[PDB]
């Protein structure tokens, strides 16, 4: 990846988070929601991935395939349609 990947969570701009909450139905948003979103988000991701990569290591590959994620999400209880079938 060359340039060291750092502080990319703050790459979930405030406008974007606000957008997600609009599609969510939220009308007004406290100023402290944003960082709170990154916190929840980051954990969600670390998990789906952590399991995904486990699947990748089990298959002995250097690539994380769409299925690896689809399986990760399934066991996480967040089943997703549109990539693994």
């Amino acid at each position: 990846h060359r340039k060291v990947l750092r502080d990319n969570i703050q790459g979930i701009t405030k406008p974007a988070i606000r957008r997600l909450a609009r599609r969510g139905g939220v009308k007004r948003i406290s100023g402290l929601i944003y960082e709170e979103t990154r916190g929840v988000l980051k954990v969600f991701l670390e998990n789906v991935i952590r399991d995904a990569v486990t699947y990748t290591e089990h298959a002995k590959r250097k690539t994380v395939t769409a299925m690896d994620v689809v399986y990760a999400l399934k066991r996480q209880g967040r089943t997703l349609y549109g990539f693994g079938g």
């Binding site: 089943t79 997703l80 349609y81 549109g82 990539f83 693994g84 079938g85």
Partner: protein, 94 residues
């Protein structure tokens, strides 16, 4: 070289029966394919357990039927169970 399966071909046949002149996108068929599979697995697995539970070693239609009943919600089940029991007799009638 590398043969990928799916239900796309069948999903389609069905689409044309309900909506003769309607089409379905790639992403849409994607969703649909996942669906048949989530449900295929859901029922098969449910039947599987039903058999182990009954110390029996084979999955009959009967098992698949309680699976569907345990799995599917209300009206969907009725219809599924009927449609299901139907096709089999129509089948066993050689």
């Amino acid at each position: 070289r590398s043969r990928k399966e799916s239900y796309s071909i069948y999903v389609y046949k069905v689409l044309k029966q309900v909506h003769p002149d309607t089409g379905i996108s790639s992403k849409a068929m994607g969703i649909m394919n996942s669906f048949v599979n989530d449900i295929f697995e859901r029922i098969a697995g449910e039947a599987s357990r039903l058999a182990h539970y009954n110390k029996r070693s084979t999955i009959t239609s009967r098992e698949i039927q309680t699976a569907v009943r345990l799995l599917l919600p209300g009206e969907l089940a009725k219809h599924a169970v009927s449609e299901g029991t139907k096709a089999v007799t129509k089948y066993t009638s050689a």
